[PDB]
Design an enzyme around this catalytic site. Sequence first.
Site, PDB file in Angstrom:
ATOM      1  N   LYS A 146      -6.603   5.198   6.337  1.00  0.00           N
ATOM      2  CA  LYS A 146      -6.796   3.740   6.279  1.00  0.00           C
ATOM      3  C   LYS A 146      -5.468   2.999   6.130  1.00  0.00           C
ATOM      4  CE  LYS A 146     -11.625   4.002   5.078  1.00  0.00           C
ATOM      5  NZ  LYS A 146     -11.593   5.493   5.086  1.00  0.00           N
ATOM      6  N   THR A 193       6.566   0.573   6.944  1.00  0.00           N
ATOM      7  CA  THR A 193       5.964   1.646   6.172  1.00  0.00           C
ATOM      8  C   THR A 193       4.868   2.337   6.988  1.00  0.00           C
ATOM      9  OG1 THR A 193       6.525   0.619   4.065  1.00  0.00           O
ATOM     10  CG2 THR A 193       4.670   2.197   4.052  1.00  0.00           C
ATOM     11  N   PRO A 253     -19.194   5.972  10.008  1.00  0.00           N
ATOM     12  CA  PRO A 253     -19.551   6.577   8.723  1.00  0.00           C
ATOM     13  C   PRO A 253     -20.644   5.780   8.021  1.00  0.00           C
ATOM     14  CG  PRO A 253     -17.704   5.134   8.395  1.00  0.00           C
ATOM     15  CD  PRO A 253     -18.079   5.011   9.860  1.00  0.00           C
ATOM     16  N   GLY A 254     -21.141   6.327   6.915  1.00  0.00           N
ATOM     17  CA  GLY A 254     -22.225   5.712   6.173  1.00  0.00           C
ATOM     18  C   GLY A 254     -23.586   6.317   6.471  1.00  0.00           C
ATOM     19  N   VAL A 255     -23.586   7.414   7.226  1.00  0.00           N
ATOM     20  CA  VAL A 255     -24.801   8.144   7.562  1.00  0.00           C
ATOM     21  C   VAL A 255     -25.157   9.125   6.445  1.00  0.00           C
ATOM     22  CG1 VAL A 255     -25.832   9.785   9.186  1.00  0.00           C
ATOM     23  CG2 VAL A 255     -24.326   7.959  10.031  1.00  0.00           C
ATOM     24  N   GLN A 279     -25.073   7.003   2.230  1.00  0.00           N
ATOM     25  CA  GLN A 279     -25.029   5.548   2.161  1.00  0.00           C
ATOM     26  C   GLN A 279     -26.218   4.881   2.842  1.00  0.00           C
ATOM     27  OE1 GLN A 279     -21.057   3.763   2.852  1.00  0.00           O
ATOM     28  NE2 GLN A 279     -20.339   5.879   3.064  1.00  0.00           N
TER      29      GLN A 279
HETATM   30  O1  BMP Z   1       3.188  -6.987   1.063  1.00  0.00           O
HETATM   31  C1  BMP Z   1       3.808  -5.942   0.821  1.00  0.00           C
HETATM   32  C2  BMP Z   1       3.325  -4.959  -0.063  1.00  0.00           C
HETATM   33  C3  BMP Z   1       4.102  -3.848  -0.275  1.00  0.00           C
HETATM   34  O2  BMP Z   1       3.702  -2.919  -1.131  1.00  0.00           O
HETATM   35  N1  BMP Z   1       5.302  -3.666   0.369  1.00  0.00           N
HETATM   36  C4  BMP Z   1       6.059  -2.423   0.104  1.00  0.00           C
HETATM   37  O3  BMP Z   1       7.241  -2.767  -0.595  1.00  0.00           O
HETATM   38  C5  BMP Z   1       8.369  -2.051  -0.042  1.00  0.00           C
HETATM   39  C6  BMP Z   1       9.327  -3.015   0.605  1.00  0.00           C
HETATM   40  O4  BMP Z   1      10.522  -2.312   0.907  1.00  0.00           O
HETATM   41  P1  BMP Z   1      11.779  -3.025   1.567  1.00  0.00           P
HETATM   42  O5  BMP Z   1      12.596  -3.710   0.393  1.00  0.00           O
HETATM   43  O6  BMP Z   1      12.549  -1.809   2.204  1.00  0.00           O
HETATM   44  O7  BMP Z   1      11.313  -4.037   2.560  1.00  0.00           O
HETATM   45  C7  BMP Z   1       7.798  -1.008   0.905  1.00  0.00           C
HETATM   46  O8  BMP Z   1       7.487   0.190   0.191  1.00  0.00           O
HETATM   47  C8  BMP Z   1       6.502  -1.653   1.364  1.00  0.00           C
HETATM   48  O9  BMP Z   1       5.541  -0.702   1.787  1.00  0.00           O
HETATM   49  C9  BMP Z   1       5.754  -4.637   1.206  1.00  0.00           C
HETATM   50  O10 BMP Z   1       6.829  -4.575   1.775  1.00  0.00           O
HETATM   51  N2  BMP Z   1       5.003  -5.741   1.420  1.00  0.00           N
HETATM   52  O1  BMP Z   2     -16.451   1.952   6.292  1.00  0.00           O
HETATM   53  C1  BMP Z   2     -16.197   3.129   6.016  1.00  0.00           C
HETATM   54  C2  BMP Z   2     -15.053   3.784   6.507  1.00  0.00           C
HETATM   55  C3  BMP Z   2     -14.867   5.104   6.150  1.00  0.00           C
HETATM   56  O2  BMP Z   2     -13.834   5.801   6.605  1.00  0.00           O
HETATM   57  N1  BMP Z   2     -15.727   5.754   5.294  1.00  0.00           N
HETATM   58  C4  BMP Z   2     -15.443   7.159   4.941  1.00  0.00           C
HETATM   59  O3  BMP Z   2     -16.460   7.966   5.505  1.00  0.00           O
HETATM   60  C5  BMP Z   2     -16.883   8.970   4.555  1.00  0.00           C
HETATM   61  C6  BMP Z   2     -18.315   8.728   4.166  1.00  0.00           C
HETATM   62  O4  BMP Z   2     -18.786   9.871   3.473  1.00  0.00           O
HETATM   63  P1  BMP Z   2     -20.285  10.011   2.981  1.00  0.00           P
HETATM   64  O5  BMP Z   2     -21.161  10.529   4.199  1.00  0.00           O
HETATM   65  O6  BMP Z   2     -20.175  11.104   1.841  1.00  0.00           O
HETATM   66  O7  BMP Z   2     -20.788   8.667   2.561  1.00  0.00           O
HETATM   67  C7  BMP Z   2     -15.886   8.915   3.402  1.00  0.00           C
HETATM   68  O8  BMP Z   2     -14.772   9.764   3.686  1.00  0.00           O
HETATM   69  C8  BMP Z   2     -15.422   7.466   3.432  1.00  0.00           C
HETATM   70  O9  BMP Z   2     -14.135   7.288   2.861  1.00  0.00           O
HETATM   71  C9  BMP Z   2     -16.825   5.105   4.849  1.00  0.00           C
HETATM   72  O10 BMP Z   2     -17.654   5.650   4.125  1.00  0.00           O
HETATM   73  N2  BMP Z   2     -17.036   3.809   5.200  1.00  0.00           N
END
Ligand code: BMP
Ligand code: BMP
Lengths: 218, 222
Positions: free
Chosen positions: B66, B73, B174-176, B179
């Site tokens: 996700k 990043t 997902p959600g089958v 859920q």
């Molecule tokens: O809105 C956001 C939220 C974050 O966590 N970050 C995180 O903060 C850090 C920013 O690093 P930098 O100073 O190199 O731009 C990165 O780890 C990034 O994933 C961001 O830049 N913006």
């Molecule tokens: O909208 C979403 C998106 C997802 O990736 N998932 C993912 O799908 C899986 C659902 O698993 P489960 O059948 O045990 O509910 C989990 O890994 C969850 O993180 C979800 O349930 N809903």
Amino acid sequence: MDVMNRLILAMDLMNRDDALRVTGEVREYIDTVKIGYPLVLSEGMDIIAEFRKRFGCRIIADFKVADIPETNEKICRATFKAGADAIIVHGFPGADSVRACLNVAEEMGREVFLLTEMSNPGAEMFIQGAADEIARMGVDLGVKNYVGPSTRPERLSRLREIIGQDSFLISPGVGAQGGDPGETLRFADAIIVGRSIYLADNPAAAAAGIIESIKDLL
Amino acid sequence: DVMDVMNRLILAMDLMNRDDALRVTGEVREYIDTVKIGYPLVLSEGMDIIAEFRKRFGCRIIADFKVADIPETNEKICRATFKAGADAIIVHGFPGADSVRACLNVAEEMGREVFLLTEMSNPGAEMFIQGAADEIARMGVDLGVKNYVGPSTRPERLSRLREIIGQDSFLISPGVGAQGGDPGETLRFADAIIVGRSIYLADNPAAAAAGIIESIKDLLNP
Ligand SMILES: O=c1cc(O)n([C@@H]2O[C@H](COP(=O)(O)O)[C@@H](O)[C@H]2O)c(=O)[nH]1
Ligand SMILES: O=c1cc(O)n([C@@H]2O[C@H](COP(=O)(O)O)[C@@H](O)[C@H]2O)c(=O)[nH]1
Ligand SMILES: [Cl-]
Ligand SMILES: [Cl-]
Ligand SMILES: [Cl-]
Ligand SMILES: [Cl-]
Ligand SMILES: [Cl-]
Ligand SMILES: [Mg+2]
Ligand SMILES: [Mg+2]
């Protein structure tokens, strides 16, 4: 939370040797390190305990947690098992997903930071319009720690207004993304800084320079 | 062409220890050739778990991370994930087009795939994501995204998502089971269903998988 020099290092180098060396170079300036997926996915979750062993620093796991409640719980548990003191969680998936994280944090003696608006230009498309409401949701849920964008000081100021002076606010986007350290600290308790420090020719001098520029705010 | 998902069924392997995760995946191997590995397992056992699944099973791996960070990043996360052997990665669209583009660019460079998550299956998704979802989906189509994730728990929403992305796009859902989503009804719109707990917590995961497959038997391709 008491952050040395109001400065949090975003350690996004992706190899262990460099990450440890550079963090060591700036250790006199910080006591709080944000560790995210670039480092964790490259070197493993064991890196967190190793930072604690070497530096004694507090660790914020920046995992942008953004799944359903059931999965969020598991992610938070695995993260805190690795020794993280706090975790960053998205608000966009809704209140149930945030509550799941809050529950595990309480159980393990840790903190949740709620990310309300992001710093990238793309944040304007969907997040920004929801961000005030996400912040109010944080307030309703009892969230005390927040993340908001250095790149939009007017938005950061609004976030501070919503959450109040008692809440803790940290802010990325300083340096590389254009944000100013001093201006950001008008509203945030601490600034997050990555590349300006860890990609600098001289990371120690870079960190020292940032601190010098905000010395009257410390 | 799209990935050829055996039995239209993807295992969500969210067990958090290696021994149980490996055992259960092995037990359902005759039914499922595509496994979704997320952070519950990866943060517990390391990225080498992807390698171990590849070694042990003949299974495609979708890294359900996700991805939801800034472009810089996101790129790094995708690079590390594909380096470890994931065939595909799931990314959020709500951080905006630049964040999605970053992932697509890495996937193109590295010869792998991005799946765009447009709406989620949890009740909380109604608060913010639902209202943005059609636009997130349209953005995906505009960016050239070919693979999507949408919620089985909301059939009318899943149907609309299929309309937006078109019949050629690949959609997993997902959600089958746990859920409440129904396998057959979900496959009206999705190419494949994602199933976690109702397989991996079953007394006999193989029987559980076989049972799901029997209920959708007439929906499989020749
Ligand atoms: O809105 C956001 C939220 C974050 O966590 N970050 C995180 O903060 C850090 C920013 O690093 P930098 O100073 O190199 O731009 C990165 O780890 C990034 O994933 C961001 O830049 N913006
Ligand atoms: O909208 C979403 C998106 C997802 O990736 N998932 C993912 O799908 C899986 C659902 O698993 P489960 O059948 O045990 O509910 C989990 O890994 C969850 O993180 C979800 O349930 N809903
Ligand atoms: Cl849930
Ligand atoms: Cl954008
Ligand atoms: Cl960026
Ligand atoms: Cl909710
Ligand atoms: Cl619906
Ligand atoms: Mg390794
Ligand atoms: Mg100054």
